[PDB]
Amino acid sequence: FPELKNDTFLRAAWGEETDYTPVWCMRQAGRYLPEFRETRAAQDFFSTCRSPEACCELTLQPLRRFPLDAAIIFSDILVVPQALGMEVTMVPGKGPSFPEPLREEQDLERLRDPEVVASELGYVFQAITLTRQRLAGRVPLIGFAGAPWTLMTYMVEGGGSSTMAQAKRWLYQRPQASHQLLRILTDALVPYLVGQVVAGAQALQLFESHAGHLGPQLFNKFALPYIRDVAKQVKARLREAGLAPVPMIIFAKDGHFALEELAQAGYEVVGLDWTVAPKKARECVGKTVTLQGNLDPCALYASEEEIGQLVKQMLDDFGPHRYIANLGHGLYPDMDPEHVGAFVDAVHKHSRLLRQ
Amino acid sequence: FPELKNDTFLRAAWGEETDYTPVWCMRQAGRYLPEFRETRAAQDFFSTCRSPEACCELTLQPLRRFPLDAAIIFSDILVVPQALGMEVTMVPGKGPSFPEPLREEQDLERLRDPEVVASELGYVFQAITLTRQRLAGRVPLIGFAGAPWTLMTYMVEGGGSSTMAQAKRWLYQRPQASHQLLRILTDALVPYLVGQVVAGAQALQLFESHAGHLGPQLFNKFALPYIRDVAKQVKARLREAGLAPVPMIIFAKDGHFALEELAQAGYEVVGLDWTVAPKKARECVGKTVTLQGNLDPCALYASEEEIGQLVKQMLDDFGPHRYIANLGHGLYPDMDPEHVGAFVDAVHKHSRLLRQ
C-alpha cells in the first residue's frame, strides 16, 4: 500500500496534537450527491455493495468535492445480517428491509455459523483494498460495521422502528436467546472487522445507532458487553496476525447515559450525537479518549455563513485537543453539497485560527 | 365538584411527604385495554374525542382495573392543531395524520387566531367536567396538551418522523416563521389549559414528546422559551380568575440535556424518560422539583415478578421524596393489562415497604 500522506485524522484519533482539526462526515458517500444517485441507478442497493469498483467509486466521490481528512468505505451495516443468511429487499425508495425478520428463538437456526461470515463478505475486503490503492495515501480509509445490539434491532424489527418494541421485547421476554443472537453477531463482527484491516482499512468505526432506545440498565446487560468484546477481540487478533492495531471509534447515537462507560470500553474515539453538549461530553469521557462529532446534520440547512458560526461555536466548545470534527448523524439525502463543503472549510479555517 | 378523597398524587406533586408513592401511567387509557378498543370501534379517532360521555368512559376504564392514583383525561395532543384549522385523517390503523402539513411560511395563513381555539375545544372541557363529576373525588384528574415545539413537529411533518428533518429545516431556514408558529401555538395552548382547569382538571401535563430531536442550542431558542411561557401565563390567568393554580408537569422525552433548565421553567414536576438514571436526574434537577417516571414501558413485557424487581430498583434510586411513579413513555398497545396491574401494585407495595 502507498504511504499515507495526510494522517491528521489518525494522529487526532490516537490523542496526538495536530495543526488543525481533521473532519469527515458520516454518509459523505450518500444520496445528497447527484453523482452518487447516478452510479447507484445502474444496479440496486446490495448489488452495488458487491462490486468492488462501484464501492470504490462511491467512496472517492466526496473526496473529489471536499478536502475531507478521511474516506469511509461505502457499504451498509446490513451486509453482516445478510452474510449471516438473512434476505434483504431494499425496495422502491423505502430503505432497509428484512421481509422475514427474526421473531422467535427458533429463527436463530436460519443463520450461518458466524465463523463463515468473513468469507461471505470477500467483496467488501476487495473494495477496501482497491479503495486503499486508488486513494494512493491521500488520507486514511475507515472501515466500519454496525454494533451487535443495532444489528439485532434490524434483524428482529425487519428495518427501522420508532420504539424498538419488538427488539426490546426480546431483551425482556427472551434474554437467553437475545444473548445468543448478540454473541453470534459479535463472533461474526470480529473476523469481519479484522478482515477489513487486513484488506487495508486504517481505522474502524462501530455504529451503535439504536443505543438510545435502551436505558442504562438494558444497555449495560445487552449492548455494552458486546461493544467491549468487539474491540478486545479485534485488537487481539490483529496483534497475533503481526499487524498494527488501528484507531477504533464507538458511535452510540442517543447514548448520553453510557458515555462514561463507553470511554472505558477499549475505543480510542467516542463519537457523539448533537444532543450532548461538547463540554459535558468532555466531563463524562475524561482526558483519555478522543471525541468525534457532533454537528446537528440539519444545521447544514442553514446559510453557509450560519454553518461557519455554528462550527466556530462547536470547536470553541470541544477545544483543540483530542477532537475529530464530524456531524452528529449521517448526512440527509436532501442536503446541499455546497453546504457540506462550507462545513469542511469552516472546520479547517476556524481550527487553525483557534490555534493562533 | 366532589371533595377529592385521595390526593396523594397532588401532595407528591407539590413536594410534600406521603405515605406511599403515587403512580399513574401515560396512555393508561389506550389500545392495550380490550374495552378501550371496543368503545372506540363505535366511532373514529377524533369523533370519540368529541363525545364527552365517550371520553369520560375511556378515562374511567383503567381506574376500574387498577388502583391508579390519578386519572388523565382521554384526548389527543393533536386536538389543538385541529382546533387551529388543520385537517386530520387518522386512518385504517396508521395513526396521526395531517394530509396537508404546513410546508411554507404562507401556510400559516390557514390557521385560526389562537384566541378562538378554546371555543373550538369546548367538547374537551365538557368531557373534563363530566369526568371530574363521575370520578366523584376518587383521585385527581390530570388535563394535558402537547408542547408548542412538539405540536409544531406534527403540523410540519404531517405526523410521526424519525429525524424531524422538515421541522428542523424550518428552525434553520425559517427561524422567524418558526417563532411565529410557536407563539401561535403558545397563545392557543394557554387559554386551552386554563379552560381545562376551569372545567375541573386538578393538574396539567405538558407533553414535549419530540424534545430529543433538538440539541441544547435549538431547544433553548425554540422549545424552552415557549415551555416557560405556557406555565407563567397559565398560572397568571388562573390567579386572576380567582382560581387555585394546579401542579404542572413538563415531560420532555429524550430531553436529558435540558433537565437543568426544565427544573427552572416553572413546573412543579419534571417527567422523565427511561434513558436518564434517576440518581443522575436528581443531580440535574436539584431538591426543588418533583420527578415523575420513569420505567421503560417495554419492561412490562417481562414477568410480573421481574416487573416487581425492576420497580423495587427504580424506587430505591428515586427515594421516597418528591417522586411520582410513572413509565418513561406511554403504554404500548400490545401490552398485558395484568402486567400494568403488576406495575401499579409493586409501586404501592414497595414504596410502603421502603418507608418501613
XYZ file of N, CA and C in Angstrom, chain A residues 163 165-166 168-169 172-173 212-216 218 256-257 274-277 296 298-299 301-302 306 310 332 334, chain B residues 163 165-166 168-169 172-173 212-216 218 256-257 274-277 296 298-299 301-302 306 310 332 334:
168
model
N -39.732 2.659 18.245
C -39.752 2.180 19.642
C -38.825 0.993 19.921
N -39.781 -1.787 19.999
C -40.648 -2.570 20.883
C -40.453 -4.073 20.740
N -40.300 -4.556 19.502
C -40.128 -5.990 19.267
C -38.765 -6.464 19.762
N -36.783 -4.882 21.969
C -36.754 -4.770 23.441
C -37.616 -5.842 24.129
N -38.699 -6.260 23.467
C -39.474 -7.412 23.912
C -38.598 -8.669 23.962
N -36.434 -8.422 27.140
C -37.225 -8.675 28.351
C -37.842 -10.067 28.453
N -38.405 -10.568 27.351
C -39.016 -11.912 27.321
C -38.110 -13.090 26.942
N -29.919 4.477 21.975
C -30.737 5.348 22.819
C -32.110 4.825 23.175
N -32.551 3.770 22.486
C -33.799 3.084 22.801
C -33.702 2.292 24.124
N -32.476 1.969 24.519
C -32.217 1.263 25.759
C -31.942 2.272 26.875
N -32.374 1.986 28.080
C -31.892 2.791 29.198
C -30.544 2.233 29.654
N -29.950 2.857 30.679
C -28.681 2.403 31.237
C -28.644 0.913 31.576
N -30.562 -1.852 30.580
C -30.604 -2.748 29.423
C -29.326 -2.662 28.588
N -26.081 9.290 25.543
C -25.642 10.192 26.625
C -25.403 9.451 27.946
N -26.275 8.490 28.256
C -26.258 7.800 29.540
C -25.086 6.834 29.677
N -25.604 15.082 18.308
C -25.703 16.506 18.585
C -26.470 16.864 19.874
N -27.054 15.878 20.564
C -27.845 16.185 21.771
C -26.991 16.331 23.053
N -25.720 15.921 22.991
C -24.775 16.129 24.103
C -23.980 17.424 23.849
N -23.977 18.321 24.831
C -23.081 19.473 24.823
C -21.647 18.945 24.864
N -25.252 18.893 14.570
C -26.577 18.533 14.069
C -26.568 18.557 12.527
N -28.811 18.702 10.461
C -29.811 19.636 9.980
C -29.286 21.049 9.990
N -28.257 21.310 10.784
C -27.627 22.617 10.779
C -27.147 23.010 9.385
N -28.781 22.999 6.734
C -29.872 23.624 6.002
C -29.767 25.098 6.148
N -28.963 25.536 7.107
C -28.767 26.930 7.392
C -27.879 27.526 6.301
N -24.037 30.928 8.442
C -24.544 30.380 9.697
C -23.822 29.080 10.092
N -21.859 28.229 13.527
C -22.203 27.052 14.316
C -20.985 26.147 14.516
N -28.236 13.898 5.406
C -29.562 13.566 4.858
C -29.548 13.760 3.359
N -31.395 15.201 1.203
C -31.860 16.464 0.606
C -30.920 17.633 0.882
N -36.541 11.728 12.128
C -35.495 12.770 12.102
C -36.002 14.188 12.383
N -36.588 16.121 10.246
C -35.795 16.863 9.261
C -36.523 18.073 8.693
N -37.820 17.927 8.402
C -38.595 19.030 7.832
C -38.815 20.132 8.863
N -37.041 20.615 11.677
C -35.737 21.235 11.987
C -35.219 22.118 10.839
N -35.559 21.754 9.598
C -35.312 22.616 8.449
C -36.024 23.963 8.618
N -33.948 26.046 11.106
C -32.711 26.544 10.491
C -32.901 27.492 9.311
N -33.835 27.171 8.413
C -34.123 28.020 7.240
C -35.190 29.110 7.404
N -36.123 15.532 22.071
C -34.795 14.941 21.910
C -34.189 15.043 20.529
N -35.005 15.407 19.537
C -34.537 15.665 18.180
C -33.708 16.965 18.095
N -33.912 17.849 19.064
C -33.183 19.099 19.147
C -31.954 18.916 20.040
N -30.861 19.566 19.718
C -29.776 19.622 20.694
C -30.056 20.767 21.667
N -29.155 20.964 22.639
C -29.281 22.047 23.608
C -29.532 23.420 22.985
N -30.701 24.488 19.854
C -32.007 24.643 19.209
C -33.150 24.631 20.225
N -32.675 14.723 28.242
C -31.572 14.669 29.221
C -30.776 15.979 29.283
N -30.543 16.589 28.119
C -29.683 17.761 28.007
C -30.322 19.020 28.584
N -37.044 6.793 30.275
C -36.262 5.744 30.910
C -34.748 5.796 30.619
N -34.297 6.709 29.754
C -32.864 6.755 29.404
C -32.004 7.552 30.413
N -32.651 8.304 31.308
C -31.947 9.002 32.400
C -31.987 8.123 33.664
N -30.818 7.869 34.247
C -30.732 7.258 35.570
C -31.389 8.213 36.566
N -39.047 2.074 31.807
C -39.141 1.654 30.410
C -40.470 0.904 30.188
N -41.417 -0.993 27.992
C -41.149 -2.329 27.495
C -40.821 -3.274 28.622
N -40.405 -2.740 29.762
C -40.165 -3.569 30.929
C -41.401 -4.378 31.313
N -43.124 -6.212 29.477
C -43.150 -7.451 28.715
C -42.536 -8.530 29.530
N -41.834 -8.140 30.585
C -41.160 -9.056 31.462
C -42.205 -9.739 32.343
N -40.496 -10.089 37.623
C -39.425 -9.232 37.120
C -39.801 -7.741 37.189
N -37.822 -4.724 39.021
C -37.437 -3.524 38.287
C -38.016 -2.267 38.942
N -47.704 0.671 25.411
C -47.830 0.205 24.020
C -49.063 -0.658 23.889
N -49.765 -3.501 22.637
C -49.669 -4.966 22.743
C -49.345 -5.441 24.155
